[PDB]
Symmetry: C4
């Protein structure tokens, strides 16, 4: 129950906020990863819309909400959709389940939906630390490649906020 | 006013429409058993946003060149354009609901349905609130009554609790539609 | 253009004593009971005019305001608008591009089939070439004639209302101005 | 690679910033493309959102009203989402090395074309944005080396604004390149 790859499990979660939650997520092999700016922007933006001025600005915001809602729905109604499941996520890496096992050292990108109303996916380049199967299937232990100052700060804030939300 | 359809399900019609603003109108409406409404906040946001943008204007095209610079008017124009284009995109792929006469209140709705459904059936009422915006309002609901009048199967649906925010937005929406229907009369 | 001699009465009703522009653009008439929306038409026209604006001689960087954040927001809007435009152009049924005669009162355009005077429907046309947004205006056929090659229709827009009418008049005037260049 | 068309390489890259990079690009033989305005809007807008990337991280964190900051966030979300939608059904352009100047571009085409062929150079300027830059161009040289067919496209006059935008874009491209 996690101790089927204790070495990685410790590297990814020891002494750091590690959340256990259900969300669409998966590992995709590729030499073509994503961008840090993009992931940072996505994270901070989700957070900034946490919860006025001249009427024109108030109605501009109403228009924005309508646009986001429409576009949000169009994507969610045609996208492939990632495998929904229980994952263990920290600023260092993620413990999720994938269709097939992978050799440790396999490069790629972890794809996850940080929010469920918004179908925008978070793409984080990562490598496999371990690939042990038993939850009937193959579980992956992915280690994110260095995030950089900004993205890492965003991710910790995201996880911290996500945790308190859950702790209530 | 005074549609005898209520005589098909007296107790249901009373539950949904007695002592509350109940509007009889025509608009794209439907009911589906296999739900997927989303959140109360999405429905609430749609209704409120829709209200802020609709109901004509203050009969003036100015108001912007004053109090506001010009870079912002440009931005507002672009939003109007994007919104219209996104609405155009949607009409391209989405299956539209069929037009029908319905009786709508904050509690539920009475509408015609292709197939009958026994009371107790759970699902979602689908409605296109606007007209210029191809967006659907989905509201989880239960079938209170099901009856026929001879050519159409009628359903009386009671909405699942809407929550403070959405309820408020719907009440405002209904109140608005009402004065407007009476207005252009 | 001598197309007017095919229906003098209709041509006079639509273009006499008012600004009338002869130009090429996608435009069509479709028999329908779609009441369209004055507000939608007015919004499209005024918004279009706002973005078709400036970038004239004070182009490049017409700086006057201050906030840098708002400038970035405006850049984002330009990018969004451009992409959304492309998407719509993917699976949308394009209109027929032909020469037309347009005034605040109605329009003369080519049509697949002729129609009896009094036939009501909607005139559809693409105001700007760089954006796939269409303007819809309820109209009735005044005249219907052929030049031996095509069916020409003279459509009279139903009352536009004060706001839409003003927007359309502004639209046609700028259009006329723009084209009297060189 | 380049001697294949001495005169064409001198006309397009002599005494002017020329960058060597890899990105989706292609030449499409079309009757008439156009719109410098659309091309300039794209480059100028890209640049502004490109600088929004780190470097002081912000001209002023709080600054304007909080409602504004949040509307800006929604914009980021909308752009991302629409970008994702565009990718669901668009056609990617082959990645390739190209030499690009404000005057023209040299790229690898799946076929050759005679000098005078006209159309549009198609480029995807930013990896994060699925938007293509289209610039009317003519072919002034087509030659083949080992395998690939190489084309020398000479942009049709860009006009004051577009030219400025492209020169700025290329300079930023260059500067960022030196930052390896």
């Amino acid at each position: 129950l996690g101790t089927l790859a204790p070495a990685a499990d410790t590297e990814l979660f020891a002494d750091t906020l590690s959340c256990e939650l259900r969300l669409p997520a998966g590992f995709h092999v590729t030499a073509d990863p994503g961008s840090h700016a993009t992931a940072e922007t996505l994270l901070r933006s989700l957070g900034q819309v946490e919860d006025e001025l001249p009427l024109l600005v108030q109605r501009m915001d109403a228009k924005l909400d309508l646009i986001l809602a429409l576009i949000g729905r169009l994507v969610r109604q045609s996208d492939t959709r990632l495998a929904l499941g229980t994952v263990h996520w920290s600023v260092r890496g993620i413990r999720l389940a994938s269709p097939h096992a992978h050799p440790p050292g396999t490069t790629g990108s972890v794809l996850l939906q940080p929010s469920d109303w918004l179908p925008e996916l978070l793409q984080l380049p990562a490598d496999v630390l371990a690939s042990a199967s038993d939850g009937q299937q193959h579980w992956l232990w992915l280690r994110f490649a260095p995030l950089g100052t900004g993205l890492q700060d965003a991710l910790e804030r995201h996880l911290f906020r996500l945790h308190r939300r859950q702790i209530a």
